């Protein structure tokens, strides 16, 4: 006859929210079918669904969302899927890889690859993605899957755990008319099985209005009408209004609240033929998953596959460093030991630390461009904050921060002719690696939690300029006054320029035919590399060389702890 006997209802009685008050008296039940929450954008159309699930703060509402006469159970995260309005699924991965990534984190670890492969192929067969799963999704740069199946594959990541009460946030925004009915036929097909498809459409059509089972109208937190969708036009026809011939039924309800206002329609539905039945049923009915290794493996795997398939930012960063080091070694080719050798040595050493410190602005776009995905998967039951922070860090700050540092010193070293030593080559390589790591770690301590990329970049270029002045070349570090010399310890390029300067100006002379390593007659000459280090404020002991390394290592852990605390205390609602 049919296909199901009962469904998981979701009843609510007196829903009041305040942030100040955004919802007043909202009540009604949601029978298992395909119900919709209509209304304008200024009301609680897109805000009722956030309180219907677990998307808002518990200290803001005062009602109660009962599920079959019982409150929200503990398996609700695994029995309800929320579909985000904007894009969520990555474009650098295919449909099978996107479904397998969420299937490996949402399902339990007791399931092998046999049940997970047939579960993914089952969702693919119901989603109609047999020929799409074998292709990449695509983004603004590569083409693969158009927008007709982007919303289909976005909901496929939620049907992995076989939910009962599926939630959607405007599933028709960003589509046309053919794809709206294509995506709605699948929702009606899944609704006929036994799912409670609740969403909030925005200005639909008659071909989509006829498919709704229930309908709730909201306008500025006031319940205007709640009942079947077929009886919505008949209720307003005897209340004082009447729709015209050849008119959209959904547009007539939105035209009534606008002026064919909000104080007379709220006092109409409270004493009608649809409020006493709902109040009679409402008072009757009302009176992590995986381990840390599996999360750190699948998160770093998806981030590494995303970084490998993005040639516009990974390979371009290597070409911009290869052509930079080639033109640097070509200009400084021939570092002689004369009067001009000190200016060439200090300029080539200062430019390497300034370029490594100013190239960390590109690393800011790491947590800000994927903020909606982190706040969506974290409150859904995917991983924790430490697993996401370590998975994105092990896949982005390691192969893109250490690669331009090693290729930048293996070319200009044998090309310039700094110090022909085996240990000196590895010292400046490790110094540039610690400089780029500390600058990117400082970049992550500012952009964590924010969304606007213009403020994190304006504040970073401002503090990078202030740290660039205190490096040791534009101004001497010993002539600064006492109430300002303490600011030299709060920089980044200074530790790199100090360790880079100590590694070269050592047993090198700078005056031809004037041995001044034991006797320097006529002062004010600087005829050795040691006189330049003391003239700038550098210690000649070997401890002074490793002091900047132990200072940059401490600044790395401090900035990473601040970035982790900023991601832990973030508002996930």
């Amino acid at each position: 006859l049919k296909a199901f006997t009962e469904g998981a209802v979701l009843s609510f009685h007196n829903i009041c929210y305040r942030v100040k008050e955004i919802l007043s008296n909202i009540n009604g039940i949601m029978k298992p079918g395909l119900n919709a929450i209509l209304g304008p954008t200024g009301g609680g159309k897109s805000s009722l669904l956030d309180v219907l699930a677990a998307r808002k703060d518990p200290s803001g509402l005062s009602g109660d969302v009962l599920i079959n006469g019982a409150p929200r159970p503990a398996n609700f995260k695994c029995n309800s899927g929320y579909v985000v309005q904007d894009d969520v699924v990555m474009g650098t991965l295919t449909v099978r890889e996107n479904l397998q990534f969420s299937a490996a984190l949402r399902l339990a670890t007791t399931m092998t690859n046999h049940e997970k492969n047939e579960r993914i192929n089952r969702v693919i067969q119901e989603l109609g993605l047999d020929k799409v799963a074998d292709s990449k999704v695509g983004t603004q740069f590569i083409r693969g899957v158009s927008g007709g199946e982007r919303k289909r594959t976005s909901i496929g990541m939620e049907l992995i755990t076989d939910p009962s009460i599926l939630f959607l946030d405007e599933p028709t925004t960003g589509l046309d008319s053919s794809t709206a009915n294509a995506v709605l036929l699948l929702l009606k097909r899944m609704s006929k099985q036994g799912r409670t498809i609740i969403f909030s459409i925005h200005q639909p059509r008659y071909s989509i209005f006829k498919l709704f089972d229930s309908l709730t109208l909201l306008a500025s937190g006031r319940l205007m009408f709640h009942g079947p969708a077929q009886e919505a036009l008949g209720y307003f026809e005897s209340a004082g209004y009447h729709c015209e011939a050849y008119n959209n039924p959904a547009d007539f309800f939105l035209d009534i609240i606008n002026g064919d206002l909000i104080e007379k329609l709220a006092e109409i539905y409270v004493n009608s033929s649809f409020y006493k039945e709902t109040k009679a049923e409402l008072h009757q009915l009302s009176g992590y998953t995986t381990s840390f290794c599996h999360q750190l493996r699948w998160v770093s795997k998806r981030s590494f596959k995303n970084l490998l398939g993005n040639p516009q930012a990974s390979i371009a960063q290597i070409i911009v460093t290869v052509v930079l080091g080639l033109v640097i070694g070509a200009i400084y080719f021939g570092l002689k030991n004369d009067s001009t050798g000190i200016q060439n040595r200090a300029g080539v050493l200062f430019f390497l630390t300034t370029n490594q410190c100013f190239s960390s602005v590109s690393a800011v776009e790491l947590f800000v461009v994927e903020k909606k995905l982190f706040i969506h998967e974290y409150i859904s039951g995917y991983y924790r904050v430490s697993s996401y922070f370590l998975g994105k860090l092990l896949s982005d700050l390691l192969p893109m921060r250490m690669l331009p540092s090693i290729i930048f010193t293996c070319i200009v070293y044998f090309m310039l002719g700094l110090k022909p030593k085996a240990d000196a080559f590895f010292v400046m390589m490790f110094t540039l690696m610690m400089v780029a790591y500390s600058a990117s770690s400082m970049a992550l301590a500012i952009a964590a939690g924010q969304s606007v990329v213009s403020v994190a970049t304006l504040l970073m270029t401002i503090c990078f300029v202030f740290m660039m002045i205190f490096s040791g070349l534009l101004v001497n570090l010993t002539t600064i006054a006492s109430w300002l010399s303490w600011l030299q310890y709060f920089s980044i390029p200074r530790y790199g320029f100090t360790a880079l300067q100590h590694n070269e100006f050592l047993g090198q002379n700078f005056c031809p035919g004037l041995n001044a390593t034991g006797n320097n007659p006529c002062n004010y000459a600087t005829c050795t590399g040691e006189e330049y280090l003391v003239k700038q404020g550098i210690d000649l002991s070997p401890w002074g060389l490793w002091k900047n390394h132990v200072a940059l290592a401490c600044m790395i852990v401090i900035f990473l702890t601040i970035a982790y605390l900023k991601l832990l205390f973030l508002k996930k609602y």
Partner: nanobody
């Protein structure tokens, strides 16, 4: 990769009540939709009921009403299909099914994946 084992015996005709416990394996019992079937001596496969995982949207026979009570417990991996005042028109071996992804089951030939032997219920 799971199996179905039976335990509820059946030999009483037109009795009061009879509960059949069809336990399974211990890998992923809370990730399947356990159900039952009916094989009459002379008929093919007849669907009876199928409870979804998590104790939600279930399904019964379009003929019989709420006399059937099927409940699957996630603990011990056991599902029951008990009746209330069964009719004599029940002489049939009862099968045990285990399917993944609840597709609806409109009381027809569903043919679940992991099957079972099924015990005769007279």
């Amino acid at each position: 990769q799971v199996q179905l084992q039976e335990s509820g015996g059946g030999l009483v005709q037109a009795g009061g009540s009879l509960r059949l416990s069809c336990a399974a394996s211990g890998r992923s019992f809370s990730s399947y939709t356990m159900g039952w079937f009916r094989q009459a001596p002379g008929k093919e496969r007849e669907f009876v009921a199928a409870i979804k995982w998590s104790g939600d949207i279930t399904k019964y026979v379009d003929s019989v009403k709420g006399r059937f009570t099927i409940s699957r417990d996630n603990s011990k991996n056991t599902v029951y299909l008990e009746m209330n005042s069964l009719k004599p028109e029940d002489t049939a071996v009862y099968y045990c099914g285990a399917d993944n992804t609840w597709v609806g089951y409109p009381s027809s030939r569903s043919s679940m994946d992991y099957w079972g032997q099924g015990t005769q219920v007279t």
